[PDB]
Amino acid sequence: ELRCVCLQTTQGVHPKMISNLQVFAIGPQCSKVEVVASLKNGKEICLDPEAPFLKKVIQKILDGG
């Protein structure tokens, strides 16, 4: 059975530590959008989709240069 990937969520992480952002959109797997952040440490976190932090992080990552 398919299940959501993020049980609890975090809103605070330093952008400089982020390596990957994987976004799962609304679908059969889950009823809510969910963003997974994979860090340079090798760990994984579940960010808050609705927080202002995510948008700024994405904008920064797409404008490295």
Partner: protein, 300 residues
């Protein structure tokens, strides 16, 4: 740090379970095919003594045979996921669900027939047990009606953590709709038939304890065996399903360990329930002297 509290719950699966599952599914396929084919052969070879029970057993064996015929593709999907396409997902799910519902409802109808034949033997109600054809036709139609949602709302789902699946796609709120749809199998598949069977068999046993027939004891044992087999086969799966529903509804606290435990339990209980296609011929038909005598005659 405290971020460890917020972390994805990695789904877990093992290849040993894969191999065991394939072996079990293949063995069940073979056994169910053999038993159902033998039952159909015995019943249809001779038109002498074509009674109501024969008709009920015929329909039941047909349903179990179709279920077994569909099993192998399900086993392959459990092995490597649904690579066979959307159309086969729809058709196979429809056939499987239809046959499952039909088998359950036919068991309930058999219980009703026995209740009418024993308790109301001397009354005028027992003349209403000659409607086997219409009853079975209605049961098949109702099973078809209850499995439309599977055909309409199923497709192939491709995820990242897990292999593809023959899941349901009802829209944005698919989870809750699936939860609601789960009510039908647990109401028309477990509760209603179980209550009917318990009522009918309990009154049957009450009548049989008051009689002086020598063969009462074996009938009591057979009825108890049937009820216990049905419970052992189906109760665990529905309990696990109810637990999953509660966990999704936050009545029970949600954690990764519980998720993995429930997934394993679902797999195991589905395997256990699938055994109803192999044991029905033994419990309902082959335990009767008439069927065994007919089989021995046919082997000539």
């Amino acid at each position: 740090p405290f971020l460890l509290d917020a972390a994805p719950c990695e789904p877990e699966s093992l290849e040993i379970n894969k191999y065991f599952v394939v072996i079990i599914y293949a063995l069940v396929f073979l056994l169910s095919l053999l038993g159902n084919s033998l039952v159909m052969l015995v019943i249809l070879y001779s038109r002498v003594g074509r009674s109501v029970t024969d008709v009920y057993l015929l329909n039941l064996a047909l349903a179990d045979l179709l279920f077994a015929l569909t099993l192998p593709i399900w086993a392959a999907s459990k092995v490597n996921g649904w690579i066979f396409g959307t159309f086969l997902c729809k058709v196979v799910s429809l056939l499987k669900e239809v046959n499952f519902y039909s088998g359950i409802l036919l068991l309930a109808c058999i219980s009703v027939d026995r209740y009418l034949a024993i308790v109301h033997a001397t009354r005028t109600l027992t003349q209403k047990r000659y409607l086997v054809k219409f009853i079975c036709l209605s049961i098949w139609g109702l099973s078809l009606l209850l499995a439309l949602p599977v055909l309409l709302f199923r497709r192939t789902v491709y995820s990242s953590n897990v292999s593809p699946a023959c899941y349901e796609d009802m829209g944005n709120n698919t989870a809750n709709w699936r939860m609601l749809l789960r009510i039908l199998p647990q109401s028309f598949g477990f509760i209603v038939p179980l209550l009917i069977m318990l009522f009918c068999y309990g009154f049957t046993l009450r009548t049989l304890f008051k009689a002086h027939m020598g063969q009462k004891h074996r009938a009591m044992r057979v009825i108890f065996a049937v009820v216990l087999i049905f419970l052992l086969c189906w109760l665990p799966y529905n309990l696990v399903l109810l637990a999953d529903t509660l966990m999704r509804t936050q009545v029970i606290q949600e954690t990764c360990e519980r998720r993995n435990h429930i997934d394993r339990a679902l797999d195991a209980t589905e395997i256990l329930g699938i055994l109803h296609s192999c044991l029905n011929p033994l419990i309902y038909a082959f335990i009767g002297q008439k069927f065994r005598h007919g089989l021995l005659k046919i082997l000539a």
